[model samples]
Target: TAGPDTIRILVSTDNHVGYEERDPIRKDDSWRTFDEIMQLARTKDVDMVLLGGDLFHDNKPSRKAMYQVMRSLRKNCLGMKPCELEFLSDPAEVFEGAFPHVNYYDPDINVSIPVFSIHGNHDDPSGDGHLCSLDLLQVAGLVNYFGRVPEADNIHVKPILLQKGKTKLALYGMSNVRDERIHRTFRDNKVRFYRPSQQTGDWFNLLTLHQNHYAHTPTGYLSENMLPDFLDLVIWGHEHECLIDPKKNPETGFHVMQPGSSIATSLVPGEAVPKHIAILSITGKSFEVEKIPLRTVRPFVIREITLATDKRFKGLEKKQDNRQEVTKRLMQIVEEMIAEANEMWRSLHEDSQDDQPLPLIRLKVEYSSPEGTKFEVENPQRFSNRFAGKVANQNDVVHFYRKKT
Candidate 1:
């Protein structure tokens, strides 16, 4: 339960709305999940909705994609309900361009639940004039896009302060930047973080950024130690895993929450984690985040099989019909996976009348031969052609690789 003095907001990231738009079956997957996210915001009655970044999959989005996005925001975010949170920061200091105030505060726009976002690598600015997809939405008063600093030699972060009843909140957001450049800037003390001059400790400080949280390479991602030590919470983005619960950073003593992507763009194991968004509540200097599962996501299943050591194929190495036997066995596994996927979909949507979308399935096969023997392997794409109508991913359902001894 939320008290009158507490501020509650909904948080999510990496919508990646335009991903896989050309697929016959998976084209609508990303956009469908995005609509669910917005509907959840209205149903939960949150004060506002916060997105970390990567709202679109590509820098140059399709025209249909843009149209659908605008429709979703207008349907769920625009209404007659009054906003309860009070803006405490100076408009000149917090916003940019012609409109120097929050979107909800614009008298012309009746915004019931405002949306705030930063740009991710996929949607970052490019070209001669430095325009991004988020900028277009910002101009129409649909989204409040912030934390943008393009091609700057140095970086400085500012907070947008708000107060609801007795709770005071300070939100600091940073748009995506090149990892190595931002890392060097922090090391040289060229970056700055501005906090309230008076009663800074009385406000709950939160920072949101879209960058690699884990080190994909040596300097590919930012370290948590690089940030200031006074923050109460951090909303980290870019990664697609749904690690929504806040985990305390041992070095900074601040909590970090990652409300991963609402849709799965990759078939890797990390993308298989249950998709979730969160409701964040803050009172005084304390905060809590609750994760909510999304049912619109498609079921995905991946498996691996090694033929050399399998019990069924152990003595068939010298047989002339080995290729045919192997193909038969692999087909059985694929059928089993399809069944598993349907079970998952039924479990998640037991009472709903909506039919299930096609599930994503992947089968990895590894084969090895002895010194004197050479085994023939079937082409993965040719093998998968048989299941084209039954699965969402028709072209690349199975992957075949050789085991080097």
Candidate 2:
């Protein structure tokens, strides 16, 4: 038994671990940041870790990558402390021969920390032709699965009861479904998980889900008016941005929170949003939300420059001159972009002293020329092998930056 303010819960979701092809270094950085979060959980004496969904980049992963993930979790999360770690599986199965299924670790065998998972859009294949078997994965000891019963309209619900001396907290879990009709049904239907006939206690009730709350948005399934008034906090996933919307229903008051993706995905151009993880400290009726920005693997931007001409160059010299102009323009753009990125970094660092400095940089440039002509830029490596280069033919031109570190 402990005091009333003795429990702390750390929550994070949507860490697509296998999505490394876009940027290999960024992928590595994502893993490192997540590991650090686990380490923080240990040091902070957190009571539990809740992973919302999307643990893997794809339905499957490579063997080497899986091993690396397992090793990192073991080193940072498992047995290092007394905190219980809950990993919500992204309700999906690893198909053979698909996206290196070998990378999919057996959660039962590899993970030393206590983990749990809920299904997401990627997990349910009933609506789309995608092949994902959550049951198979669970039975294979890959993940602990939860969902609605077979007869009940495919909605999953689970309950977590946390007690510390005289204080108690209750949390309900729901797997995200892909069916559009289900959302409408959930909105209109009078669904009750436990017995509505029996009066419940004043314990905190929380709902966990992964579906888009509205029809076409990143919001979760439950709305302010949709949930019960007695419910305390709602933890959500699916949307890749961490957000908390405090709303009081005209009829009932319920607090909702969406702790976006735990890792960084594609970022909006010109925005300075860093990839991050979330920690939620809860004790009875009081709670604190913390967004921890992860270490950036690199600071880079991709710029595409297209060069098109109505007139075709007739000779090698003319083509060479055009290529030179394109290369020069590309260099100028890359340099400017680098400067802008640095300024942005500086501003961010000023605002948040904990913000990390940017690392590597990148720019991609391409071009298209007029059709019909012997014009071509040959030997890309030899032509503009310095900081920028170009590739051109009779009909088109393309150029890119090899390395910007």
Candidate 3:
């Protein structure tokens, strides 16, 4: 229910702005996705926008990327609308720097929707002051950056307590931390979470962190056991799989929601998962989430095909014939991929057609020459040059695998 006592927040992660700034077609892809996110926050009228991490693709963003990010935030987040969430926690403990307070708290700037984000591995801290790109955004009053562990060895997390009507939220956040280091800190009992002393059980506890949920290595991921069992929900970031639905961890008595990335940064299967952000409504101990598919993302398709089993090359016997057959079959496959990607785009945008960007395509070809003869793979660059204008990723469109017994 959209009631006064219910708190609604827009949740997303891994925007990765400036992902491919130099690409001919996808240079603005990440920024366009970011713009859509900010627009959703305003149009949906969310109390706050919660980003898990990796807001910027790089630790140090380029000038153009920063301008685009700032412009989008200003367009959507600044207005006459008053923030409804009442701050109940000490601002000094929740934030860093000279301001040491939430951006919306400033009476000078009218913030319609406040944005809060933690740093991720790609945009993690470095240098003398240990500053990341989020620090600049925080200074610019665009984002409330938290969860920064100044010292990796000794970690202390303070919650940002907020309330809207009767619903109270104890938001705990952790910025990008080295997986093995954080793991050791947790194991040594060096990490601590400061809980509210008054009416602690009455609030809904939520934790947002940027770290690996799976075992990337022996000690490179965080287990559910590592966190306190009192949390109501955890927003897991870092992994780019868009599993936005909350899954209950029966052992820990808490649920997790992975919002995933808004842009496809890789060609892996995980990147192909349909991208989405979540709208979370929290009322007391009860919460519900709704997923909103991102429309600005370019369609991506990847497939693998073998030549020996295909009917197209049935009568091919000569080594020279293999080359001709492979190129023709590959062209047909690429054509099919383009049609599939277009269909996918049409499925999302039934009314729009002019704004459709070129789709990213990848095809893996497996072929073996006649038993006595040898077949050479086509030069991928030269092969992809033919479809340069039709596809977004022209440089590395296809990969070849030669099968041999």
Off by over 4 Å in 1: 309-313, 317-321, 351-355, 372-375, 403-405
| Local accuracy of candidate 3 as per-residue lDDT tens digits, 1-405 | 368888789998998998999987889998989999999888888888999998889888899999999999999999998899998888878576577768898867778899988899988988888778888888888888878787889989999899999888998989878887888888999989999988888989999988888875999998887788999899999989899988999889999998889998888778889999988988887998988899989999988766666566555633445666667766887999999999999888986674578999988777666565444578879988889888999888988887565
For residues 348-392, write the lDDT of model 1, one tens digit per residue. 888676666788898877777666444567776787787877898
TM-scores of the candidates in the order shown: 0.94, 0.62, 0.93
- The ten-residue window of minimal lDDT in model 2 covers 389-398
TM-score of 2: 0.62
Considering every candidate listed, which one attains the maximal TM-score? Answer: 1
By TM-score, the better pick of 2 and 3 is 3
Candidate order by decreasing TM-score: 1, 3, 2
RMSD vs true structure, all candidates: 2.0, 9.9, 2.5
lDDT of 3: 0.86
User: What count of clashes does model 3 give?
Assistant: 0
Model 1 weakest 10-residue run by lDDT = 313-322
